[PDB]
Design a binder for this molecule. Structure first.
Ligand SMILES: C[As](C)(=O)[O-]
Ligand SMILES: [Cl-]
Ligand code: NA
Length: 223
């Protein structure tokens, strides 16, 4: 039983309202709109009175829905997660607030990286990657292990790496290898994804102007 980091959208609007205008140079990309070739399509909360409807049998549907999906998710982020990047990709972050040695000088931050996967014409899912960013707490900037070693010394470097591995569940909280690591790492991913979208249940529905989007917070299974 193989589990993949893709969380399926099991319901979405089979029809969505879109507006098209010609692309123009001053266009600034943003929510509720997408450039497609030499048109910009408005959708979701960007729809003015003027509109056309497109269904999932149309190639345009997937090109729009892949972005609309992220736009909606971006409207449903729960504290303490924050939006870091929205566009073709959705990145959310939160600070690791549990204790670890050298937390006073080194800030750790989980980052969920959310992309949309589309396959067999009508299937959508979010592909979700988890990274931990390591920040120098005094200036809130990214800091490499080498720079930690130079600035705070070898001991801090080594300890941070163990803490990072423990927060990824690559090691036990005590810093040791364990047997059940890929199961627990998936549970962590699923649990953080649930938290980030305010979900206590293994599925959640999100409202859109076109109808509901339903996501199941359970990784796809290849048996
Ligand atoms: C109208 As809205 C949910 O895009 O702020
Ligand atoms: Cl765009
Ligand atoms: Na539907």
């Amino acid at each position: 039983i193989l589990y993949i980091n893709i969380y399926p959208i099991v319901n979405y609007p089979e029809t969505i309202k879109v507006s098209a205008i010609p692309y123009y140079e001053e266009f600034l990309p943003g929510k509720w709109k997408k450039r497609i070739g030499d048109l910009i399509y408005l959708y979701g909360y960007g729809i003015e009175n003027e509109f056309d409807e497109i269904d999932n049998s149309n190639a345009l549907f997937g090109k729009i829905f892949r972005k609309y999906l992220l736009d909606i998710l971006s409207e449903n982020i729960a504290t303490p997660w924050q939006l870091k990047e929205l566009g073709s990709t959705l990145r959310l972050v939160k600070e690791i607030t549990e204790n670890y040695e050298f937390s006073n000088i080194i800030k750790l931050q989980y980052e969920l990286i959310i992309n949309v996967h589309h396959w067999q014409n009508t299937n959508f899912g979010i592909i979700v990657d988890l990274k931990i960013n390591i920040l120098d707490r005094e200036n809130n900037q990214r800091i490499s292990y080498t720079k930690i070693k130079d600035k705070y010394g070898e001991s801090v470097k080594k300890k941070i790496w163990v803490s990072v591995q423990a927060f990824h569940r690559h090691l036990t909280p005590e810093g040791k290898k364990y047997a059940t690591a890929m199961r627990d790492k998936f549970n962590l991913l699923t649990g953080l994804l649930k938290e980030a979208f305010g979900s206590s249940e293994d599925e959640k529905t999100f409202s859109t102007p076109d109808g509901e989007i339903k996501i199941v917070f359970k990784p796809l299974e290849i048996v």
